[PDB]
Design an enzyme around this catalytic site. Structure first.
Site, PDB file in Angstrom:
ATOM      1  N   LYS D  10       0.870  -1.191   0.000  1.00  7.78           N
ATOM      2  CA  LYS D  10       0.000   0.000   0.000  1.00  7.78           C
ATOM      3  C   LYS D  10       0.896   1.226   0.000  1.00  7.78           C
ATOM      4  O   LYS D  10       1.864   1.279   0.760  1.00  7.78           O
ATOM      5  CB  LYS D  10      -0.882   0.009   1.256  1.00  7.78           C
ATOM      6  CG  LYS D  10      -2.153   0.870   1.108  1.00  7.78           C
ATOM      7  CD  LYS D  10      -3.069   0.289   0.040  1.00  7.78           C
ATOM      8  CE  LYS D  10      -4.507   0.273   0.434  1.00  7.78           C
ATOM      9  NZ  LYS D  10      -5.321  -0.534  -0.533  1.00  7.78           N
ATOM     10  N   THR D  57      -3.848  -5.563   0.445  1.00  7.02           N
ATOM     11  CA  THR D  57      -3.210  -4.265   0.667  1.00  7.02           C
ATOM     12  C   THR D  57      -4.064  -3.446   1.631  1.00  7.02           C
ATOM     13  O   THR D  57      -3.519  -2.673   2.412  1.00  7.02           O
ATOM     14  CB  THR D  57      -2.973  -3.500  -0.642  1.00  7.02           C
ATOM     15  OG1 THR D  57      -4.223  -3.129  -1.223  1.00  7.02           O
ATOM     16  CG2 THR D  57      -2.147  -4.366  -1.611  1.00  7.02           C
ATOM     17  N   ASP D  58      -5.386  -3.651   1.594  1.00 10.46           N
ATOM     18  CA  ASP D  58      -6.290  -3.005   2.550  1.00 10.46           C
ATOM     19  C   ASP D  58      -5.935  -3.372   3.993  1.00 10.46           C
ATOM     20  O   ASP D  58      -5.996  -2.530   4.883  1.00 10.46           O
ATOM     21  CB  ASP D  58      -7.742  -3.373   2.252  1.00 10.46           C
ATOM     22  CG  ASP D  58      -8.715  -2.553   3.065  1.00 10.46           C
ATOM     23  OD1 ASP D  58      -8.918  -1.372   2.697  1.00 10.46           O
ATOM     24  OD2 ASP D  58      -9.259  -3.084   4.066  1.00 10.46           O
ATOM     25  N   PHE D 159      33.175  29.143 -10.375  1.00  7.44           N
ATOM     26  CA  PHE D 159      33.308  27.985 -11.225  1.00  7.44           C
ATOM     27  C   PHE D 159      34.209  28.307 -12.406  1.00  7.44           C
ATOM     28  O   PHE D 159      33.792  28.919 -13.376  1.00  7.44           O
ATOM     29  CB  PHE D 159      31.924  27.402 -11.662  1.00  7.44           C
ATOM     30  CG  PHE D 159      32.033  26.036 -12.289  1.00  7.44           C
ATOM     31  CD1 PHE D 159      32.493  24.942 -11.538  1.00  7.44           C
ATOM     32  CD2 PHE D 159      31.741  25.846 -13.646  1.00  7.44           C
ATOM     33  CE1 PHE D 159      32.650  23.677 -12.132  1.00  7.44           C
ATOM     34  CE2 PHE D 159      31.881  24.586 -14.240  1.00  7.44           C
ATOM     35  CZ  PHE D 159      32.360  23.502 -13.486  1.00  7.44           C
ATOM     36  N   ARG D 176      29.245  33.936  -8.646  1.00  9.23           N
ATOM     37  CA  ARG D 176      27.944  33.561  -9.222  1.00  9.23           C
ATOM     38  C   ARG D 176      26.988  33.265  -8.088  1.00  9.23           C
ATOM     39  O   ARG D 176      27.393  33.111  -6.930  1.00  9.23           O
ATOM     40  CB  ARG D 176      28.061  32.333 -10.136  1.00  9.23           C
ATOM     41  CG  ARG D 176      28.498  31.083  -9.385  1.00  9.23           C
ATOM     42  CD  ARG D 176      28.563  29.869 -10.315  1.00  9.23           C
ATOM     43  NE  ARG D 176      28.787  28.645  -9.526  1.00  9.23           N
ATOM     44  CZ  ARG D 176      28.729  27.401 -10.006  1.00  9.23           C
ATOM     45  NH1 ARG D 176      28.494  27.165 -11.305  1.00  9.23           N
ATOM     46  NH2 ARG D 176      28.947  26.376  -9.183  1.00  9.23           N
ATOM     47  N   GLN D 228      30.373  20.125  -6.600  1.00  9.76           N
ATOM     48  CA  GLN D 228      31.107  18.894  -6.264  1.00  9.76           C
ATOM     49  C   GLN D 228      31.959  19.096  -5.007  1.00  9.76           C
ATOM     50  O   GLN D 228      31.890  18.287  -4.050  1.00  9.76           O
ATOM     51  CB  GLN D 228      32.009  18.493  -7.438  1.00  9.76           C
ATOM     52  CG  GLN D 228      31.272  17.904  -8.665  1.00  9.76           C
ATOM     53  CD  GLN D 228      30.785  18.941  -9.679  1.00  9.76           C
ATOM     54  OE1 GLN D 228      30.511  20.107  -9.347  1.00  9.76           O
ATOM     55  NE2 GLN D 228      30.650  18.494 -10.918  1.00  9.76           N
ATOM     56  N   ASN D 254      21.651  22.006  -9.675  1.00  8.00           N
ATOM     57  CA  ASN D 254      22.264  23.315  -9.720  1.00  8.00           C
ATOM     58  C   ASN D 254      21.229  24.178 -10.439  1.00  8.00           C
ATOM     59  O   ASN D 254      21.068  24.028 -11.636  1.00  8.00           O
ATOM     60  CB  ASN D 254      23.597  23.212 -10.487  1.00  8.00           C
ATOM     61  CG  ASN D 254      24.402  24.502 -10.437  1.00  8.00           C
ATOM     62  OD1 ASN D 254      23.989  25.482  -9.816  1.00  8.00           O
ATOM     63  ND2 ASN D 254      25.558  24.513 -11.108  1.00  8.00           N
ATOM     64  N   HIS D 256      19.963  27.267 -12.003  1.00  6.17           N
ATOM     65  CA  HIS D 256      20.707  28.393 -12.577  1.00  6.17           C
ATOM     66  C   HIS D 256      19.961  29.712 -12.555  1.00  6.17           C
ATOM     67  O   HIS D 256      18.760  29.765 -12.807  1.00  6.17           O
ATOM     68  CB  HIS D 256      21.108  28.074 -14.015  1.00  6.17           C
ATOM     69  CG  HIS D 256      21.811  26.764 -14.159  1.00  6.17           C
ATOM     70  ND1 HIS D 256      23.064  26.540 -13.634  1.00  6.17           N
ATOM     71  CD2 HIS D 256      21.418  25.593 -14.715  1.00  6.17           C
ATOM     72  CE1 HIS D 256      23.435  25.298 -13.908  1.00  6.17           C
ATOM     73  NE2 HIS D 256      22.448  24.699 -14.548  1.00  6.17           N
TER      74      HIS D 256
HETATM   75  O1  LIG Z   1      29.291  23.665  -9.777  1.00 11.98           O
HETATM   76  C1  LIG Z   1      29.195  23.348 -10.971  1.00 11.98           C
HETATM   77  N1  LIG Z   1      29.536  22.077 -11.297  1.00 11.98           N
HETATM   78  C2  LIG Z   1      29.504  21.617 -12.550  1.00 11.98           C
HETATM   79  O2  LIG Z   1      29.777  20.451 -12.859  1.00 11.98           O
HETATM   80  C3  LIG Z   1      29.082  22.565 -13.596  1.00 11.98           C
HETATM   81  N2  LIG Z   1      28.947  22.456 -14.924  1.00 11.98           N
HETATM   82  N3  LIG Z   1      28.518  23.696 -15.361  1.00 11.98           N
HETATM   83  N4  LIG Z   1      28.377  24.575 -14.309  1.00 11.98           N
HETATM   84  C4  LIG Z   1      28.727  23.928 -13.181  1.00 11.98           C
HETATM   85  N5  LIG Z   1      28.778  24.286 -11.884  1.00 11.98           N
HETATM   86  O1  LIG Z   2      -5.916  -6.949  -7.106  1.00 11.11           O
HETATM   87  C1  LIG Z   2      -5.709  -6.757  -5.899  1.00 11.11           C
HETATM   88  N1  LIG Z   2      -4.536  -7.213  -5.397  1.00 11.11           N
HETATM   89  C2  LIG Z   2      -4.204  -7.096  -4.110  1.00 11.11           C
HETATM   90  O2  LIG Z   2      -3.122  -7.473  -3.643  1.00 11.11           O
HETATM   91  C3  LIG Z   2      -5.185  -6.443  -3.226  1.00 11.11           C
HETATM   92  N2  LIG Z   2      -5.193  -6.172  -1.915  1.00 11.11           N
HETATM   93  N3  LIG Z   2      -6.401  -5.545  -1.667  1.00 11.11           N
HETATM   94  N4  LIG Z   2      -7.143  -5.418  -2.822  1.00 11.11           N
HETATM   95  C4  LIG Z   2      -6.440  -5.972  -3.828  1.00 11.11           C
HETATM   96  N5  LIG Z   2      -6.670  -6.126  -5.146  1.00 11.11           N
END
Ligand SMILES: O=c1[nH]c(=O)c2nn[nH]c2[nH]1
Ligand SMILES: O=c1[nH]c(=O)c2nn[nH]c2[nH]1
Ligand SMILES: O=c1[nH]c(=O)c2nn[nH]c2[nH]1
Ligand SMILES: O=c1[nH]c(=O)c2nn[nH]c2[nH]1
Ligand code: NA
Ligand code: NA
Ligand code: NA
Ligand code: NA
Ligand SMILES: [Xe]
Ligand SMILES: [Xe]
Ligand SMILES: [Xe]
Ligand SMILES: [Xe]
EC number: 1.7.3.3
Lengths: 295, 295, 295, 295
Positions: D10, D57-58, D159, D176, D228, D254, D256
């Site tokens: 679920k 699942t219920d 950079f 920057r 990095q 990043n 921009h």
């Molecule tokens: O911090 C950055 N890392 C990168 O790899 C990069 N590539 N373009 N600008 C950037 N700035």
């Molecule tokens: O098709 C279903 N699969 C399940 O596992 C399920 N559990 N509740 N209702 C359901 N319906």
């Protein structure tokens, strides 16, 4: 302390490309969002403030546009492989490139029953994606996916026979709504390099189309015993239709629609066989995942 | 101090309804999000802590589900009018109801070229909306709209001859990309009450379809001199096709796609006639609005 | 057909400005998102494709940056008035400018209990906003607001004595959670022009601070009979503290937190006086509005 | 075909808990969103439609509320470990539980310089998160994180000295703006089980506080040579202050802010030393990651 892993690059690079056929006048557009992250002998930028090893992320952005100008951008599996290969070939100290591409839909408009030469509509936020990992000496690993495919069926879904204990309140059911957003990924066998990727180019679009078709048909036709059972049927069929896929992964939310008891109001009947009006639940949701591979 | 205006109610009420044809087995689903705000003689709840005048918002929620159970939910113009009328008829001291409905797309799936009886896809986040104001003694005012219709054309858009002064850097152009998200609203003549709204029921879906078709066709076919000129052509045609509409309003972002000069890199040509790769801009965007009425 | 209303301009223009004190070394940053829409004698751009009347939206963007370079950007009421006045004075055929500004928080960091000279944190998505309408011959109308102020109290909220009928299921309560996102707007008396706006500059920041303080204190201290009654108390106090405000409007969602009955599980007690664990509801929500003015 | 991996459960379970001190009258609230996914001997639910192996699942949802009722929910590392351990102890065939918790800020209000007993404000969308993997026979692995901490410094970032080739247009800079959204994760040494997690309870809140303080101080004080180099300094200090952490990972966009050349307009000077007004860029963005461990 030591650097155990490091990668860096440019995310959220939006790219559009147009192809113009001079003969027919027809134009075709592609729009993607691209992320490229690099790895290699770059530890000293972190530990010694040595920027000499850094290909600036701004330069990575430029490279994406230049590569899109000089190469086809479709299928995205090919474009991603070209883009990733570029970095490991150009820079001696870069040993892996990780390329993620999300392709946005621009579907050609039909005006008066005819395809328009240069007008397009965004029909759905469904995406086609690729993840391409190009690792020096280890080839090219490609995962292809579709995501954001949202579907609902109003009957022919069941859920009974589950474990019942002191934590269980859920009633068994033989007829419920089933709705999900499909995320499906197919992982290709490792490719030795760009030549091999080029050799399989026609399979990429065809396999995407197959994955989509199998997903939709199985969802619509399966009298579903659970999300688990239906998704397995989907994955099994995809693996059977394309031998170059090694695994298929599905990740599916179960988007619940609850019955509304209205019997407190003039005995109005709106549950079980009489259920007509339901309350869609925004949260919580079931989440069901599976990865299926070959025996 | 005095209360000059007050309204209150329930927002974001998600509702799903299914219709089941017993003869054919075909099911049809509707899903909406509904907001209802009330006005009337309620000042004392604010000024004197007198809750006796308050129809609880929880009760408004219940009323929405009950009304959906007992009435058709389509067209949304009719459902909204039924819902709004309920409040002014039921509660003596409530004199206006304001109902907003957003309809979500659930489009029937085609499986193997045939319409599936109970499976649906969300094809796009385009919405069909209504705003219904039901005011005691003044009838029913309905504004219908479509929103989230996202389109792009790759040529046949121009923009030249604009004002040039010391604040201007924009170059004139005879060929550009034009892309927008369409928000179009048509305002109906005032209706005297529910009987009159019922009498015009067939016009609601037909006018929505017309508005959509005119929007798409005009966008695709106009050799656009500006967003202003193209949107006016759209509005003019809608007013000509449905005499019961008083005004049409369009609100259109101009989603820019910028040329990328790559000439710094090996003299690569990617501007003007040679432009193939563009950078979509997330922000800022032009915003162009107009309301068109009858002479 | 005729143009009944038209406005156009640039939306989502992000602007940052830094002020550097040469004496102390202290830097102060401002970041805003700005929208400017113009009206005037521009109908022919829509009806006749006459672009000669259009100040390009790109030029409007340039003007915003130039105006920010040459003028203070704080308080935003002053900046918006300068920006709007520019357009009606510069262009003979433009007769109204509508300026919306959203101010983003950059709060100076405290490092080791001392204010840092050039480092800032985004403490909350709360915004301070202005809407400035500059209309030729009618002066300057300013609405100031705060939005996105999200609060919760865990007790000292009640809701009983509301209307009960056949649509009502809500139980009366003498102790509940109350949580909301505050949107509060105060509308200034009309100003004759920029000279008058300048004359009141100190009142703008002081009134914003007062509105915020009154909102927080009243929310925390009121043993609330309803959202309606508490919000009225807030508005009353703001009007009493600043005579140049004509009206105060609040728009408040009621973000529900539901009790969870766990008695089905080993008789666990989690309701009424024993309630400890609750389920926040994403939707639906109550929405309560009021505009308060002077007798 | 075979199931290679499977997990289900679920997601998006919102939980609020209040603690009431009877002596002092002071109330304290906690609000979280919780996801629980299980693994184990469940393949047959996918392959054979065997629902007997499925904990619904219920029921998982119910278990989360019951566990929150009976146990402390703070620190989240402890709550997640209790919740995960429950599933592997209760169900013989479940062998791993994966618990993700996002903690939302509810900060006690100061009214007239005094802490209020039951009123709270959401100061920022910064989150404190945990990922807890409880695997039968392999203990408890906990990753703790903070995310959504958004900061900006207006000077003291440089950079220069990066790789320059035919793909490079970026100018070197000695002054920057640097702005980022901090995502920082610290991974604890593996714990043998719940008793060991309990034994270290005081370290969890203290290490979170240290990680936050080191992040903020280093960002504010470092005359940064690159993202990095600054992020490495952060990670180094965290590892030095808590011996029970094995690795620290940072992931930093990043964000921009571009200079705007205004010299085309009356020779206005707004670049280099004269730069006052900048254009924040929504996309693309740099993305820089590193994982730092012990020698
Ligand atoms: O911090 C950055 N890392 C990168 O790899 C990069 N590539 N373009 N600008 C950037 N700035
Ligand atoms: O098709 C279903 N699969 C399940 O596992 C399920 N559990 N509740 N209702 C359901 N319906
Ligand atoms: O404060 C409240 N005001 C209302 O109008 C209401 N309706 N339901 N619950 C409520 N709480
Ligand atoms: O169609 C357009 N309308 C406008 O008003 C405008 N301003 N800049 N570009 C523009 N394009
Ligand atoms: Na290499
Ligand atoms: Na009435
Ligand atoms: Na004028
Ligand atoms: Na077990
Ligand atoms: Xe692209
Ligand atoms: Xe509905
Ligand atoms: Xe600004
Ligand atoms: Xe919680």
């Amino acid at each position: 302390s030591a650097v155990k892993a490091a990668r860096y690059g440019k995310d959220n690079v939006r790219v559009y490309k147009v192809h113009k056929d001079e003969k027919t006048g027809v134009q075709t557009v592609y729009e993607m969002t691209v992320c490229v992250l690099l790895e290699g002998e770059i530890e000293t930028s972190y530990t010694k403030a040595d920027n000499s090893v850094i290909v600036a992320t701004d330069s990575i952005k430029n490279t994406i546009y230049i590569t899109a100008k000089q190469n086809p951008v479709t299928p995205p599996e090919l474009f991603g492989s070209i883009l990733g290969t570029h970095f490991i070939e150009k820079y001696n100290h870069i040993h892996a490139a990780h390329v993620n591409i999300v392709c946005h839909r621009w579907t050609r408009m039909d005006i008066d029953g005819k395809p328009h030469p240069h007008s397009f509509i965004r029909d759905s936020e469904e995406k086609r994606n690729v993840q391409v990992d190009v690792v020096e000496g280890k080839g090219i690993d490609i995962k292809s996916s579709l995501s954001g495919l949202t579907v609902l069926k109003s009957t022919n879904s069941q859920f009974w026979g589950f474990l019942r204990d002191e934590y269980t309140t859920l009633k068994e059911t033989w007829d419920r709504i089933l709705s999900t957003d499909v995320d499906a990924t197919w992982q290709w066998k490792n490719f030795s390099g760009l030549q091999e990727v080029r050799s399989h180019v026609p399979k990429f679009d065809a396999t995407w189309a197959t994955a989509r078709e199998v997903t939709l048909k199985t969802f619509a036709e399966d009298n579903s015993a659970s999300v688990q059972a239906t998704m397995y049927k989907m994955a099994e069929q995809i693996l059977a239709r394309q031998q170059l896929i090694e695994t298929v992964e599905y990740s599916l939310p179960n988007k619940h629609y609850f019955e509304i008891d209205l019997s407190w109001h003039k005995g109005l009947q709106n549950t079980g066989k009489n259920a007509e009006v339901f309350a869609p639940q925004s949260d919580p949701n079931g989440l069901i995942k599976c990865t299926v591979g070959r025996s």
